[PDB]
Curated annotation (Swiss-Prot):
It comes from the Eukaryota. Residues 9-113 form the Bromo domain. It comes from Homo sapiens (Human). Expressed at varying levels in several tissues, whereas a smaller transcript was expressed specifically in testis. Component of the BRF-1 ISWI chromatin remodeling complex, at least composed of SMARCA1 and BAZ2B, which regulates the spacing of histone octamers on the DNA template to facilitate access to DNA. Within the BRF-1 ISWI chromatin remodeling complex interacts with SMARCA1; the interaction is direct. Component of the BRF-5 ISWI chromatin remodeling complex, at least composed of SMARCA5/SNF2H and BAZ2B, which regulates the spacing of histone octamers on the DNA template to facilitate access to DNA. It is found in: Nucleus. The gene is BAZ2B. This is Bromodomain adjacent to zinc finger domain protein 2B. Belongs to the WAL family. The lineage of its organism: Eukaryota, Metazoa, Chordata, Craniata, Vertebrata. The chain holds residues 2054 to 2166 of 2168 of the full protein. Regulatory subunit of the ATP-dependent BRF-1 and BRF-5 ISWI chromatin remodeling complexes, which form ordered nucleosome arrays on chromatin and facilitate access to DNA during DNA-templated processes such as DNA replication, transcription, and repair. Both complexes regulate the spacing of nucleosomes along the chromatin and have the ability to slide mononucleosomes to the center of a DNA template. The BRF-1 ISWI chromatin remodeling complex has a lower ATP hydrolysis rate than the BRF-5 ISWI chromatin remodeling complex.
């Protein structure tokens, strides 16, 4: 509350550490469905169904340009990429499986870097 603060968690490396995590996601062999925005002209149903499209290149641009106020807003966009994928793709598809693998990969890196 006013003039009453919890001890200051050092957040000065968060930008660099989120960039490293994102690099590792970008270079994973199962990243290919997620590297670029889904082409809304060429993928029927996507535009209407997925209210907030997100992809790694869009996260990378947002990161590079100071559009994440904090590390939680960054994790929300990464998770959004996987939640979108689950909304649109059957679990038993190459893309569906890619999404589950990537989310697992991300969540471990997140816990190990920050928790």
């Amino acid at each position: 509350s006013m003039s009453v603060k919890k001890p200051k968690r050092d957040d000065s490396k968060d930008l660099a550490l989120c960039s490293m995590i994102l690099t590792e996601m970008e270079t994973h062999e199962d990243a290919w469905p997620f590297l670029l925005p889904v082409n809304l002209k060429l993928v029927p149903g996507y535009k209407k169904v997925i209210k907030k499209p997100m992809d790694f290149s869009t996260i990378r641009e947002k990161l590079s340009s100071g559009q994440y106020p904090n590390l939680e807003t960054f994790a929300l966009d990464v998770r959004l990429v996987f939640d979108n994928c689950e909304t649109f793709n059957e679990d038993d598809s190459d893309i569906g499986r890619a999404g589950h693998n990537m989310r697992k990969y991300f969540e471990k890196k997140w816990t190990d870097t920050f928790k």
